Amino acid sequence: GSMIRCPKDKIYKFCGSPCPPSCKDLTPNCIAVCKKGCFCRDGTVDNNHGKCVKKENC
Helix, strand or coil, X not given: CXXXXXXXXXXXXXXXXXXXXXXXXXXXXXXXXXXXXXXXXXXXXXXXXXXXXXXXXX
Protein backbone atom coordinates (compact mmCIF):
# COMPACT_ATOMS: atom_id res chain seq x y z
CA GLY A 1 0.00 0.00 0.00
CA SER A 2 0.87 3.72 0.24
CA MET A 3 3.00 3.74 -2.91
CA ILE A 4 0.93 3.45 -6.06
CA ARG A 5 2.46 0.93 -8.45
CA CYS A 6 0.51 -0.66 -11.27
CA PRO A 7 1.22 -4.00 -13.10
CA LYS A 8 4.69 -4.23 -14.69
CA ASP A 9 2.95 -4.91 -18.03
CA LYS A 10 1.92 -1.24 -18.12
CA ILE A 11 3.79 2.05 -17.80
CA TYR A 12 3.36 5.25 -15.80
CA LYS A 13 2.72 8.66 -17.37
CA PHE A 14 2.17 12.17 -16.06
CA CYS A 15 0.52 13.35 -19.22
CA GLY A 16 -1.36 10.87 -21.28
CA SER A 17 -4.30 10.78 -23.60
CA PRO A 18 -7.66 10.15 -21.87
CA CYS A 19 -8.64 8.19 -24.96
CA PRO A 20 -6.13 5.45 -25.84
CA PRO A 21 -6.55 3.24 -28.97
CA SER A 22 -8.92 0.39 -28.33
CA CYS A 23 -10.82 -2.45 -29.91
CA LYS A 24 -13.99 -0.55 -29.11
CA ASP A 25 -12.71 2.63 -30.75
CA LEU A 26 -9.43 2.79 -32.65
CA THR A 27 -9.41 6.59 -32.44
CA PRO A 28 -11.74 8.23 -29.90
CA ASN A 29 -12.11 12.00 -30.07
CA CYS A 30 -11.64 13.92 -26.84
CA ILE A 31 -9.97 17.10 -25.65
CA ALA A 32 -6.24 16.81 -25.08
CA VAL A 33 -5.74 16.88 -21.35
CA CYS A 34 -2.75 15.68 -19.37
CA LYS A 35 -3.84 13.01 -16.97
CA LYS A 36 -1.42 11.12 -14.77
CA GLY A 37 -1.39 7.50 -13.79
CA CYS A 38 -0.73 4.16 -15.40
CA PHE A 39 -1.30 3.63 -19.10
CA CYS A 40 -0.73 0.93 -21.65
CA ARG A 41 2.34 0.83 -23.88
CA ASP A 42 2.36 2.37 -27.33
CA GLY A 43 1.12 0.03 -30.01
CA THR A 44 -1.42 -1.71 -27.83
CA VAL A 45 -5.19 -1.45 -27.88
CA ASP A 46 -7.48 -1.42 -24.86
CA ASN A 47 -10.13 -4.12 -25.00
CA ASN A 48 -13.54 -4.18 -23.32
CA HIS A 49 -12.14 -6.55 -20.71
CA GLY A 50 -9.94 -3.94 -19.10
CA LYS A 51 -6.62 -4.96 -20.59
CA CYS A 52 -4.48 -3.87 -23.51
CA VAL A 53 -3.39 -6.28 -26.20
CA LYS A 54 -1.27 -5.85 -29.30
CA LYS A 55 -3.04 -3.94 -32.09
CA GLU A 56 -2.65 -6.85 -34.52
CA ASN A 57 -3.80 -9.29 -31.84
CA CYS A 58 -7.22 -7.74 -31.68
